[PDB]
């Protein structure tokens, strides 16, 4: 299994983005992302042993329990790599929460993997709060920023599950977990 911790969005966030997903339809070489889909990874586990799977659920029912809801907020877009052609179209969120929840996440990776969790892929990289707008399938340009301003409550995050299919990748969401943190 091919597994990730994320945080799914609620309806003012989707449409919003949705919106936004709409500067892009005239470029076909742009590819979005279904609403449904669209999610800010804290953790990418990349391909993952089923006997590991308790594991990565308790460590978010751990995680759950110690941190509280927090507010986020959707500001402005961006693209991957930053110059040349892009790779991705994103939109920037920000707050301390996504930082904790990613922080926490890779230290319990890090006890029940040692010195495994390196082979993890993309696991040096430095966590960017990130949401997924469209990616780069063909020739496609940018398109300027679009700034959001918009707060919304944080209120859980989940463990999934990615098949890459036919029409692309197929999300199975094992686990939501509820933060209910007194910190």
């Given at each position: 299994?091919?597994?990730?911790?994320?945080?799914?969005?609620?309806?003012?966030?989707?449409?919003?983005?949705?919106?936004?997903?709409?500067?892009v339809?005239?470029?076909?070489?742009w590819?979005?992302?279904?609403?449904?889909?669209?999610?800010?990874?804290?953790?990418?586990?990349?391909?993952?042993?089923?006997?590991?799977?308790?594991?990565?659920?308790?460590?978010?029912?751990?995680?759950?329990?110690?941190?509280?809801?927090?507010?986020?907020?959707?500001?402005?877009?961006?693209?991957?790599?930053?110059?040349?052609?892009?790779?991705?179209?994103?939109?920037?969120?920000?707050?301390?929460?996504?930082?904790?929840?990613?922080?926490?996440?890779?230290?319990?990776?890090?006890?029940?993997?040692?010195?495994?969790?390196?082979?993890?892929?993309?696991?040096?990289?430095?966590?960017?709060?990130?949401?997924?707008?469209a990616?780069?399938?063909?020739?496609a340009?940018?398109?300027?920023?679009?700034?959001?301003?918009?707060?919304?409550?944080?209120?859980?995050?989940?463990?999934?599950?990615?098949?890459?299919?036919?029409?692309?990748?197929?999300?199975?969401?094992?686990?939501?977990?509820?933060?209910?943190?007194?910190?």
């Amino acid at each position: 299994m091919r597994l990730f911790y994320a945080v799914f969005l609620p309806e003012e966030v989707r449409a919003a983005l949705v919106e936004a997903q709409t500067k892009v339809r005239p470029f076909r070489g742009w590819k979005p992302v279904p609403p449904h889909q669209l999610h800010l990874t804290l953790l990418f586990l990349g391909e993952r042993p089923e006997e590991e799977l308790p594991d990565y659920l308790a460590l978010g029912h751990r995680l759950a329990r110690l941190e509280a809801p927090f507010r986020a907020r959707l500001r402005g877009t961006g693209y991957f790599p930053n110059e040349g052609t892009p790779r991705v179209w994103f939109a920037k969120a920000e707050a301390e929460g996504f930082l904790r929840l990613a922080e926490g996440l890779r230290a319990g990776v890090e006890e029940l993997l040692g010195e495994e969790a390196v082979r993890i892929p993309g696991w040096d990289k430095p966590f960017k709060p990130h949401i997924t707008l469209a990616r780069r399938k063909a020739p496609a340009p940018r398109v300027p920023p679009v700034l959001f301003g918009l707060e919304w409550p944080v209120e859980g995050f989940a463990l999934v599950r990615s098949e890459l299919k036919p029409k692309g990748p197929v999300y199975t969401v094992l686990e939501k977990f509820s933060l209910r943190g007194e910190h």
